[PDB]
């Protein structure tokens, strides 16, 4: 690993630590969980909160701030749910097959999201994705690189500078390939698995967009969302 | 009091009981109070919740449902904050000079709204209004009639059928005048005081709209509002 590759890793890890709270102490400020669509208010606040964190993380990705505000938004909107899916793996547990975020109130199973407007058609591959990603047992350096690579994908709707973004992602994919080779024993096949995860996220992204569209078209449900959520997942 | 005047009173009282919970048990579902603009999330959820209740109340006001959807919206948008001000008097206490809504968490003083984006320029006449209105010691029949009269005011922006709405309000003002004369001892001067309260609400409405506009123009603050709140107090 070169010095530049090292600086990139350092800054990305620091960016994640500054935008991911391991105590989940902010969750008490969300609309509380209720166990129709009783879980939608809590989920909406959680997702809205997470979007703000993803934005914070993205702004510290090297090269992202130099992009056009339009490109930044285009990348953010299209990849938001994928980054949320990726970052949520940190709270996911193989023992409980659930997201454990501090207290008993914030221990989320698959049934909770069902009570929030989404179906098993999304949640079944989601949990399967979470299990597979957890089994990869990523270093924090790798998990953090994966989120940055995902966010800087040039193949998103609305992007204008495809070459400048593909270059940034390549430079990031380079770092990831090098790190695994030098710092991760028995990771000879790990990189290919991680790229496959990015492909999994596209299908999950697609299914979420369909189910979100179903949800956002009903005013009684869309009124439970936050302005930020409506703006990020909206078609405007 | 005639039978028709009596039926109107009955239906309005029942409408209020169905849309005003004396236990305030729903308040636990709001984003919790935090004691910048730390109180804005709780206030936003409280106001949003109250708007839904005001809508429920309005739909049961005799003649309101027969109005145009546009007129219903025009009346609702322009008078929403005034009805909220009126209905909040039920939780207001002269002992504490505050709104007491169940537990210690939901005991709101003037400083709480200050921590929610509004200034003393609105709150000082508001509390003064609350004190004066409480001192009138309205019967439930009167307090309920006042909200209905306020809501059916023809002198609002965006209204189209001024004659049909003024007629409904007149018919309501008739009921109020009769009720006070027949059912309220020493209320010889009460009706004039209540009409003066409607005039007070206009000034309070005006000041709120200015301070809301200041708040809604800042995305970091407007993102803390609810879709319903944005829609009702919005200029669209």
């Amino acid at each position: 690993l070169s010095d530049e590759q090292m600086q990139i890793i350092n800054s990305l890890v620091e960016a994640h630590h500054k935008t991911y709270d391991d105590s989940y102490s902010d969750f008490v400020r969300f609309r509380p969980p209720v166990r129709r669509l009783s879980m939608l208010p809590h989920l909406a606040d959680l997702v809205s909160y997470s979007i703000q964190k993803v934005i914070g993380f993205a702004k510290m990705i090297p090269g992202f701030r130099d992009l056009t505000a339009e490109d930044q938004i285009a990348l953010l909107k299209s990849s938001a749910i994928e980054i949320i899916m990726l970052r949520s793996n940190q709270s996911f547990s193989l023992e409980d097959m659930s997201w454990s975020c501090g207290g008993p109130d914030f221990k989320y199973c698959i049934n909770d999201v069902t009570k929030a407007g989404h179906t098993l058609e999304l949640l079944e591959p989601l949990v399967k994705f979470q299990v597979g990603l957890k089994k990869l047992k990523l270093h924090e350096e790798e998990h953090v690189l994966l989120m940055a690579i995902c966010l800087l994908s040039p193949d998103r709707p609305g992007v204008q500078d495809h070459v400048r973004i593909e270059a940034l992602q390549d430079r990031l994919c380079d770092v990831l390939q090098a790190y695994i080779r030098i710092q991760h024993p028995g990771g000879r096949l790990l990189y290919a698995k991680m790229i496959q995860k990015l492909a999994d996220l596209r299908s999950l992204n697609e299914e979420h967009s369909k189910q979100y569209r179903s949800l956002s078209f009903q005013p009684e449900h869309s009124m439970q969302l936050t302005p930020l959520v409506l703006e990020v997942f909206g078609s405007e | 009091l005639s039978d028709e005047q009596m039926q109107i009173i009955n239906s309005l009282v029942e409408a209020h009981h169905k849309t005003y919970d004396d236990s305030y048990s729903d308040f636990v579902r709001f984003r919790p109070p935090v004691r910048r603009l730390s109180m804005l999330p709780h206030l936003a959820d409280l106001v949003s919740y109250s708007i839904q209740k005001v809508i429920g109340f309005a739909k049961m006001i005799p003649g309101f449902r027969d109005l145009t959807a546009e007129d219903q919206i025009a009346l609702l948008k322009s008078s929403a904050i005034e009805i909220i001000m009126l209905r909040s008097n039920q939780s207001f206490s002269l002992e504490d000079m505050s709104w007491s809504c169940g537990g210690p968490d939901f005991k709101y003083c003037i400083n709480d709204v200050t921590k929610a984006g509004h200034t003393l320029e609105l709150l000082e006449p508001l509390v003064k209004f609350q004190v004066g209105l409480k001192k009138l010691k309205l019967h439930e029949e009167e307090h309920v009639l006042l909200m209905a009269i306020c809501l059916l005011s023809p002198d609002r922006p965006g209204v189209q059928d001024h004659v049909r709405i003024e007629a409904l309000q007149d018919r309501l003002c008739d009921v109020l005048q009769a009720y006070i004369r027949i059912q309220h001892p020493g209320g010889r001067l009460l009706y004039a005081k209540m009409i003066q309260k409607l005039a007070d609400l206009r000034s309070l409405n005006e000041e709120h709209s200015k301070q809301y506009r200041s708040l809604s123009f800042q995305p970091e603050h407007s993102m803390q509002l609810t879709p319903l709140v944005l829609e009702v107090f919005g200029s669209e």
């Binding site: 703000q52 934005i55 702004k59 505000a69 930044q72 938004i73 953010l76 909107k77 302005p227 930020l228 703006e231 990020v232 405007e236 | 995305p219 970091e220 407007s222 993102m223």
Partner: peptide, 9 residues
């Protein structure tokens, strides 16, 4: 996208 634009400074 007024919120996003604000959050992106």
């Amino acid at each position: 996208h007024k919120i996003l634009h604000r959050l992106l400074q």
